[PDB]
Design a binder for this molecule. Structure first.
Ligand SMILES: Cc1ncc(C[n+]2csc(CCOP(=O)(O)OP(=O)(O)O)c2C)c(N)n1
Ligand SMILES: [K+]
Ligand SMILES: [K+]
Ligand SMILES: [Mg+2]
Ligand SMILES: [Mg+2]
Lengths: 536, 493
């Protein structure tokens, strides 16, 4: 790279080299690393911003700790760009977030300097304790350290971890990256130090050096500048939801909406401002969000849990045990359903149509466009026999016309086109492509609307009038909606070939949503090819 | 029981004179003859206007006295005095602040009180609940039945004697008009699969230094008592924290050890995200010993390990094994333990094993089922411990019988071979039919466009009620006679 523009950064290709530089040279390095971050990564990545706040902390860590031998763990990892830059990926940083480029967050297979693959938050301390325990048994003096944000240390996990750490007392350092006190951490069993200036590299080095050597659970609380923030993980469906939320809240006082620290992402900013008394941000606590909704439901209100498909994974037990078993009519507005894009593997809303389907009493809806979305939220909100869910992708609507809200009959699909030989059953926002395939193959097209309960009569009807069925969904094929269709046919002993089109059995790689959907054969062309190969 | 006899409703309890209450506790305590919440239960129903005021018990395992003055745990559909249906722990505070906020907006002065044990306050969801309450500050009382909070946002009171009936009454009454979140701290006083698991653990821990066994507060339940005593340095009880349990295992694997997470199928539901994000995505070889898989019996809907094979199955890189007997179980534990390319799981039911011969440990080829009987027209694919019954059906209908062994990856060749060899297939599993093992079988046949009819036998789409395992299995048709009857009717379609 521009060796003359960054004379000091140039002297670092590995942390080993970095540890060779003299202390007084570090402040200058930090300046070059900060400028380099702003000059090489596409601003379209947003996370470069979160990285800015850890520049000094990262240099201090790799200078004091013996990495990659010592184990460094970043929570979430959206703040690890400088970490990647200082660990042999300086000249590859410009490709981060892109298809075939560096991972959006630390990834174990990408580098020996990445100890834990992260994306969801609050996992650092737990894995960290496991790592420190192994290091202690190893007996080679391997050191452990975790960097966790003020927001991430909000999850129950973090508490379970810290409480456990407080008991077995492993030699490890937990660094609180506070960019928004210590009594709690001391009560939990940690030796607390801070708050400290997180942008004083030399000050952090001498502090880190001392604590790296101390025994037992150590906790350093630092403060970093938050900056202007970053973008969260035809109107978007998030805005559709938000708008519906506001208008519904104005109609009746029973609406209560909850988010686990994703107000903006789920499109609830305007809502939270106009109805502060109907809004709840439980912090990064998906588990409490759901059971809190149960309580509200029990108390006679109508709770709505706004949660991403990927994060809803952490509240599975509350959904099933605290809401489903009790038939509590909680409405789940699941955003980021399907492939989410740049965030990659750790954030795909690839499994909700499966893990939710095996749950008794659960009603699962999948809108094909923004009007259907509104109608289903409406239906879900007025469905009081149990829990209901409406899932939608990250992205813009199709631009359809919006009709007056009307409850949709539960478990009923609707044929959109009458064809021959082939009947394509669509579940979700992949409809536009499915529509192209049907028109191109003169096949029958059905918008299933409900994943559960399934419109069995309609399935049986399509099977009886066609040679083969094709199911389309943006979710894992295994256990998903198509799988549900197969189950119905098998039960009635009407074995009609069914091609289940959906997500393959591997975690979906990062890239553009369009770019990744095409690569997986989830577009008109790709789908027709699959059908061709299958029939062949 | 002269004092208790005068109590058939909590309204009658409130009519009695204070001085009489202590005698009631002694009687109530002898009637039962858990008994450690007698004094508190009375105090609460005596001071609070229940069932108008909402009383929430965490876990419910110790709600017997509560039920007398009023299912194994409090169930909303049973009584109106059971505000929240429980089973799993740490839900009280969570649903409770939800109920407190509702009561706040209702404006009818309805009170909210949650009773939680010291074990339940170790769960991550209790931490999230208290934090949130300390923020929005709803009017409510959390009672810690002990047999930091001020830092979370609560006004702490105590400690106080939990066995002093009149004492608790006075205190509860004194806190009547205290606003915001209040916290009252009181002080109170034939082999089974679980067995083969524990023995296997001890045996294995004696062969290497890598094994590490973790449990989220269920030592005896998972039959690990012996192991904890013989290999204290390989045992880890992380309290009621399923999430941390799994991610802690991930860390042990990253460090070079071979972690084994011993957890109930129901509770594993609470660590779903850690299993998927912290183990599967990193392809870390953690082994999961899933106990109480299938119908557990007396514990009811809140403890049924019924979705086990459905939620793990959609996860990429996951290896799922379903022992048909105790010998298979040890082979699979051994296999899963030495499978280093990713996470593996071995699920087994609560209760006694079949009584088969135990053969020396040997690795099983991943994703390979085995044909046990070759019949005609029908091929029965078994997944799990319902095999004895499935075998009876096989002999009765002269059907081919196969022990699939793996739920994932499935033995596709065997499935395609069987489908080509018969007119129909029948899958048997003690898991929800929807998204289960058999469902996976359907998927293979369809992907190959070889649609032979398949009869998926498993648990129905409703939470199954409490009752002995045999009773529930016979009632659901997971009986030999029930299965055969199901097959006949299915073929009669
Ligand atoms: C379990 C989980 N829930 C939600 C998210 C979405 N998320 C990603 S970043 C973030 C906030 C993290 O806050 P903090 O650790 O203080 O870092 P900061 O946002 O200040 O950069 C959230 C909610 C997540 N990654 N994981
Ligand atoms: K509802
Ligand atoms: K293993
Ligand atoms: Mg922060
Ligand atoms: Mg207790």
């Amino acid at each position: 790279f521009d060796i003359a523009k960054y004379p000091t950064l140039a002297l670092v290709d590995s942390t080993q080299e970095l540890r060779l530089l003299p202390k007084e040279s570090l402040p200058k390095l930090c300046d070059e690393l900060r400028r380099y971050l702003l000059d090489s990564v596409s601003r379209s990545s947003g996370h470069f911003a979160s990285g800015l706040g850890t520049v000094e902390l990262t240099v201090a860590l790799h200078y004091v700790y013996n990495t990659p031998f010592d184990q460094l763990i970043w929570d979430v990892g959206h703040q690890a760009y400088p970490h990647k830059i200082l660990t042999g990926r300086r000249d590859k940083i410009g490709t981060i977030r892109q298809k075939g480029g560096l991972h959006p967050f630390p990834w174990r297979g990408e580098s020996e300097y990445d100890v834990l693959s992260v994306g969801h938050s609050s996992t650092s301390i737990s894995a960290g304790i496991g790592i420190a325990v192994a290091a202690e048994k190893e007996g080679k003096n391997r050191r452990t350290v975790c960097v966790i944000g003020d927001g991430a240390i909000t999850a129950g996990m973090a508490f379970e971890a810290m409480n456990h750490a407080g008991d077995i007392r492993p030699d490890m350092l937990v660094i609180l990256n506070d960019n928004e006190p210590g009594t709690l951490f001391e009560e939990l069993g940690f030796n607390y130090i801070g708050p400290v200036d997180g942008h004083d590299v030399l000050g952090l080095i001498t502090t880190l050096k001392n604590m790296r050597d101390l025994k037992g659970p150590q906790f350093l609380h630092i403060m970093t500048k938050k900056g202007r923030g970053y973008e969260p993980a035809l109107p978007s469906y998030s805005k559709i939801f938000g708008d519906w939320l506001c208008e519904t809240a104005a109609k009746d006082n029973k609406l209560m909406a909850i988010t686990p620290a994703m107000r903006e992402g789920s499109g609830m900013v305007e809502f939270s401002r106009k109805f502060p008394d109907r809004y709840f941000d439980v912090a990064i606590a998906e588990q409490h969000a759901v059971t809190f909704a149960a309580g509200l439901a029990i108390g006679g209100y109508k709770p709505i849990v706004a949660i991403y498909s990927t994060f809803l994974q952490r509240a599975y037990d509350q959904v099933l045990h605290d809401v489903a078993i009790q038939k509590l009519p909680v409405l789940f507005a699941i955003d980021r359903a399907g492939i989410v894009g740049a965030d990659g593997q750790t954030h795909q809303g690839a499994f909700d149509l499966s893990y939710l389907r095996c749950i008794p009493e659960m009603v699962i809806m999948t809108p094909s466009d923004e009007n259907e979305c509104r109608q289903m939220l409406y239906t879900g909100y007025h469905y009081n026999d149990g829990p209901s869910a409406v899932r939608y992708p990250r992205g813009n609507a199709v631009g359809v016309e919006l009709t007056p809200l009307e409850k949709l009959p539960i478990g009923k699909g609707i044929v959109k086109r009458r064809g021959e030989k082939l009947a394509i059953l669509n579940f979700g926002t992949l409809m536009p492509e499915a529509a192209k395939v049907a028109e191109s193959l003169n096949a029958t097209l059905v918008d299933m609307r409900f994943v559960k309960p399934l419109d069995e009569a309609l399935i049986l009807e399509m099977a009886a009038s066609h040679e083969a069925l094709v199911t389309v969904e943006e979710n894992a094929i295994m256990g998903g909606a198509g799988s549900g269709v197969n189950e119905v046919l098998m039960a009635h002993r009407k074995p009609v070939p069914v091609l289940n089109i959906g997500l393959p059995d591997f975690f979906i790689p990062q890239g553009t949503q369009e770019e990744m959907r095409a690569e997986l054969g989830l577009d008109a062309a790709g789908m027709e090819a699959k059908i061709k190969a299958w029939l062949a």
